Design a protein around this ligand. Structure first.
Ligand SMILES: Cc1cc2nc3c(=O)[nH]c(=O)nc-3n(C[C@H](O)[C@H](O)[C@H](O)COP(=O)(O)OP(=O)(O)OC[C@H]3O[C@@H](n4cnc5c(N)ncnc54)[C@H](O)[C@@H]3O)c2cc1C
Ligand SMILES: Cc1cc2nc3c(=O)[nH]c(=O)nc-3n(C[C@H](O)[C@H](O)[C@H](O)COP(=O)(O)OP(=O)(O)OC[C@H]3O[C@@H](n4cnc5c(N)ncnc54)[C@H](O)[C@@H]3O)c2cc1C
Ligand SMILES: CC(C)(COP(=O)(O)OP(=O)(O)OC[C@H]1O[C@@H](n2cnc3c(N)ncnc32)[C@H](O)[C@@H]1OP(=O)(O)O)[C@@H](O)C(=O)NCCC(=O)NCCS
Ligand SMILES: CC(C)(COP(=O)(O)OP(=O)(O)OC[C@H]1O[C@@H](n2cnc3c(N)ncnc32)[C@H](O)[C@@H]1OP(=O)(O)O)[C@@H](O)C(=O)NCCC(=O)NCCS
Lengths: 565, 565
């Protein structure tokens, strides 16, 4: 008889519980959830706030009763594990129903307590109109503030996934919104210049997006005056649970009816610390690949643990459900001695942003610099599917790689269509240990409504490869504004295109006239070339080097550049 | 240097021509096209017939003038090469304008003549109302018949990609349609049971689909009576260009106003065989992986060539655009001494079939049997994105692999959403040398509107891996109709579900009562178990196997079976 206890019952816990039963009928499995529900859809919580997900029943995927009938698993909801005593092999559990305590023994334990929303050390942030979100009750309070407080302006603080989803939900309920982010961009998985497409989509919606800004102080003011129709006032724009006055880092003031805290999460480490299990350097539970804590009888998985980055091998914190689920299943496997190892996290992510999807995998420009890994990068802006078929959208896609060995570091993609497709192709490409030169040979699905003759992945591949082979020579969006005196700027777009934006003092010879007009450019200068998106630019660059000019081509074009400003 | 001549100016030829200019400014490049257009969107022809692609001009991606201005290649249209003299390094060209001919010399030559539609030996089939579709003029003739013959009922012969697309396209135009296939399914790249979903969708549209049946005779009879409004006749349903009477293999007659011939294509090999170039067993031109014919001064690419199958090493013929383009570019590379090698063809295909996409990569069940390769197969019916978010669609997915080594042979998917994504993923993966155990560790992009905690692929991976390791034991749809009295048929769906189809004689114990009701099943028989989709069945299987019963799970459940006839 194995006795297995499971702490937390969502992505990690519950995935383990089901797998453990599939692997043993003799085992005793008890799952502690401190809240009311297990197997809930944390990811959809904002989609219910918007009504996009209509019925809340949709957010609960298993029940203590379903888990007993299917899997002979005892779920105890409203039981919080309050200590582990390892030597003894006992947990101490409290029943939140009434504050009483008991202990339960175990052969093996799994910890899957998740991560709690960060509360920032900000004066008066704890008030009745300020909420975080990690579970249904957190959601209900948000919901209850919107109805009770008649919310008409709301402020989200945090430009990661949750905060962007929250901002979009509130917009959908027709509430004016301000999003604030300390950083210079939303969605840090992508790089700033990629974020740019998201930035315009947000502004274009009438959202008031403040980047590079902090919340300094929150003053909460109770409402002492109830307007009434009896008294000839207007009750429409009243806020009966009160009001918030925010102070920003720049001294400015924001008047709002509701404030959502989405600045990220920090591992539930308290149980582990108290029990003397090792915590890594990032504040997350240390685990090996198996995935044991420093006690071999105790495993841990999910948002609570530090795991290995796929690319670098360094520890990293990645609160994502897919790894949590798959870790949790693997942990079951190892409880029955299967000795399976988890293969690192690429940090594959995606987020919806109104009409856009922003996603990424692997490593970004930020993270590669700050680890002193030399890299190069490429940009393409190619149609999601064959341009001659209607409904093509521009996929803007960055690929980061080893300029010499060809290694795939990261990729990112923003667009209206086919973004998830491209981040997955990449995530498998990079996990499989493909290199950019091999990407060239990918053979993906082309019918006019689903793809193209050469897919963005194929075009990115050629572009990076031309650079690795010496067949192209990059210049980037951030190096073109400081130009030397032996450098000439060439715009190869048609003249009709200059009205949409350009660079000061560029010479304009359109690509289709270049061969004939080449003698207009001095061979003693280095030619710095820009199309709209990269592609014509590369035609020009080839014309020129082929005639013995030194040249460079603006990778990703005026587009990449424009959206970086 | 260098003098380069190209025969054919579309997918192969033009890719070659453009790449070649980017490599050298000094080379002469001349490209012969026998038709009037170059770089035309062959794939859009059906979609312009329907008006989905509104504009004729959208179909022409380059012109002789565009190619001269941008790439300084000399595009000679209406010039048909009629001979190659290898010894002399001379081709003979006929100007189709006046039938005059002239010789042109080359340093290296490129063959990209494409593939003609097949001419079936059918009495009477050449007539003013029957058409094949290869190019823009064929397209115009079809439109012309449609208009002038007032087509109200049309017939398509051929159930492959082009056939399905014209069947669909004529349906969008209001025309009652019939599709005929000799095989027992459309879309051969996937397997009969997978095609099943498409057949259903085609019939649901009021299309008359007749599988396993051929056209035996065509009788074309001219119209002699012009109905007149002056005569007080009804003019609504007249077809003044005449009528067709088709005799089918089963004796039956079919009356129709237009007949579209789409029974596949056969390589343009004449010029190649007249010049003594090597031809392969399948009837296309033989090349090495560098794209050289047996005359090493002569490259060949595209539809006319036999290529090296990715999975087997054997020759195949696959008429696809992606390969043709990329072959063409590499041919250009090779003409400049770069000696790059093509890396085989996966057969990656996809086709719209009304609301469905039907797609594949790799080898199908038919191809593997017929080549004596041992395989297993897994089926899965997962939602395209998290079920709790609106708009999930069932993704029916087949995985074909080696049960010992884990080699990935092929994959197929059919459904309303996300099929191109799961087929692209599989392609990358198999071409990266992944195995099924390895598919388990994929990290794809999950947010509620785009994927799931465990994607279609992750699930497929768990299923096959479980069989690889003996944690599962399959039975398949074709096997469950032939049972022995050592075997007991057990249905673990709920009683309500049996109303929608079932297997006669099965015992019903819904999975959620099975643990408590197990003793009701004799341990002296092997339990053959089915869910609707496979999932509840694999839970039941684990229960039984774990309590010492012998069991098989019907892979793909009743849904796979349902659609297998
Ligand atoms: C609003 C929101 C949107 C998200 N969107 C996405 C998305 O699109 N894609 C994606 O991949 N991920 C998304 N996530 C993240 C995903 O939810 C988490 O990565 C995943 O749920 C982590 O699973 P976990 O098992 O580590 O912890 P959790 O899901 O946090 O479950 C842990 C549980 O353990 C319980 N617990 C903690 N302490 C105790 C105790 N001592 N005793 C008993 N129980 C305890 C907690 O009550 C909690 O319910 C989102 C998360 C949120 C909050
Ligand atoms: C209706 C239709 C839909 C299709 N859809 C898809 C799809 O969805 N996805 C996909 O991957 N593929 C699709 N294809 C196939 C794709 O078009 C071909 O695989 C591709 O065009 C092959 O390129 P090629 O260069 O070998 O042949 P071609 O494109 O046929 O070009 C060859 C050219 O050479 C000319 N020529 C031939 N002989 C001579 C001569 N001897 N002298 C001078 N000139 C000559 C020909 O007229 C022809 O114009 C589709 C094809 C059709 C017809
Ligand atoms: C749902 C939940 C309980 C998982 O339980 P599960 O039964 O293991 O999950 P699934 O429905 O995905 O079942 C997968 C199993 O079905 C099997 N399978 C899937 N489809 C199959 C098919 N058609 N035929 C046969 N087997 C199939 C798989 O092999 C797998 O079993 P395995 O691990 O033994 O190999 C858990 O993931 C959960 O609590 N999730 C909700 C909460 C959450 O994930 N939150 C994160 C934020 S969104
Ligand atoms: C269009 C056609 C003539 C080829 O022209 P092309 O210039 O070689 O191909 P593209 O327009 O895709 O451009 C490819 C080049 O742009 C480069 N590139 C693409 N995007 C870039 C970007 N934004 N920045 C820099 N370079 C870029 C690629 O590397 C490649 O150059 P390379 O081979 O020198 O490395 C040819 O593919 C064709 O005739 N198509 C129509 C026929 C057809 O495909 N149909 C059959 C059935 S649909």
């Amino acid at each position: 008889m194995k006795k297995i206890l499971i702490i937390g019952g969502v992505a990690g816990g519950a995935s383990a519980a089901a797998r453990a039963r599939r692997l043993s009928e003799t085992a005793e499995i008890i799952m502690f959830e401190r809240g009311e529900y297990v197997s809930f859809a944390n990811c959809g919580l904002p989609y219910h706030i918007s009504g996009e997900i209509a019925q809340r029943s949709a957010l609960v995927l298993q029940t203590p009763e379903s888990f007993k009938a299917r899997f002979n698993v005892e779920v105890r909801v409203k039981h919080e594990v309050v200590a582990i005593d390892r030597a003894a092999k006992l947990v101490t559990v409290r029943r939140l129903l009434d504050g009483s305590e008991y202990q339960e023994s175990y052969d093996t334990l799994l910890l899957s307590p998740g991560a709690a929303p960060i509360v920032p050390p900000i004066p008066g942030v704890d008030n009745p109109l300020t909420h975080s979100l990690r579970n249904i009750p957190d959601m209900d309070r948000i919901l209850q503030t919107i109805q009770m407080n008649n919310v008409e302006h709301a402020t989200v603080v945090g430009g990661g996934a949750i905060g962007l989803e929250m901002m979009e939900s509130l917009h959908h309920l027709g509430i004016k919104t301000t999003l604030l982010e300390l950083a210079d961009q939303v969605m840090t998985p992508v790089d700033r210049e990629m974020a740019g497409f998201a930035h315009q989509a947000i502004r274009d919606q009438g959202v008031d997006l403040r980047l590079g800004t902090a919340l300094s102080e929150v003053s909460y003011q109770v409402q002492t005056h109830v307007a009434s129709d009896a008294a000839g006032e207007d009750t429409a724009h009243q806020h009966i649970k009160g009001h918030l006055s925010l102070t920003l880092s720049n001294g400015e003031l924001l008047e709002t009816d509701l404030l959502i805290m989405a600045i990220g999460v920090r591992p539930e480490t308290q149980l582990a610390r108290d029990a003397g299990l090792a915590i890594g350097e990032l504040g997350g539970i240390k685990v090996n690949a198996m995935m044991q804590t420093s006690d071999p009888a105790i495993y841990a998985v999910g948002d609570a643990v530090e795991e290995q980055d796929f690319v670098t091998g360094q520890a990293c914190l990645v609160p994502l459900a897919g790894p949590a689920n798959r870790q949790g299943r693997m942990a079951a496997d190892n409880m029955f001695g299967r000795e399976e190892r988890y293969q690192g996290t690429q940090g594959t992510a995606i987020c919806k942003v109104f009409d856009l999807a922003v996603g990424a995998t692997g490593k970004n420009e930020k993270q590669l610099k700050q680890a002193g890994i030399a890299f190069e990068k490429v940009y393409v802006h190619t149609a999601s599917h064959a341009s001659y078929y209607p409904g093509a959208e521009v996929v803007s896609f960055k690929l980061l790689f080893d300029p010499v060995k060809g290694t795939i570091f990261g990729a990112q993609a923003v667009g209206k269509d086919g973004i998830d497709k491209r981040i997955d192709v990449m995530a498998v490409a990079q996990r499989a240990g493909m290199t950019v030169e091999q990407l060239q040979h990918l053979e993906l699905s082309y019918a006019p409504p689903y793809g193209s003759a050469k897919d963005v992945i194929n075009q990115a591949a050629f572009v990076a490869s031309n650079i690795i082979k010496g067949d192209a020579t990059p210049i980037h969006f951030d190096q073109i504004d400081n130009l030397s005196e032996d450098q000439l700027l060439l715009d190869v777009r048609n003249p009709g295109e200059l009205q949409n934006g350009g660079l000061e003092g560029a010479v304009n010879i359109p690509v289709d006239e270049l061969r004939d007009r080449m003698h207009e450019l001095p061979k003693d200068k280095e030619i710095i070339i820009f199309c709209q998106v990269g592609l014509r630019g590369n035609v020009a660059y080839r014309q020129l080097v082929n005639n013995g000019y030194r040249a460079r081509n603006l990778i990703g074009g005026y587009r990449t550049y424009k959206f970086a400003s």
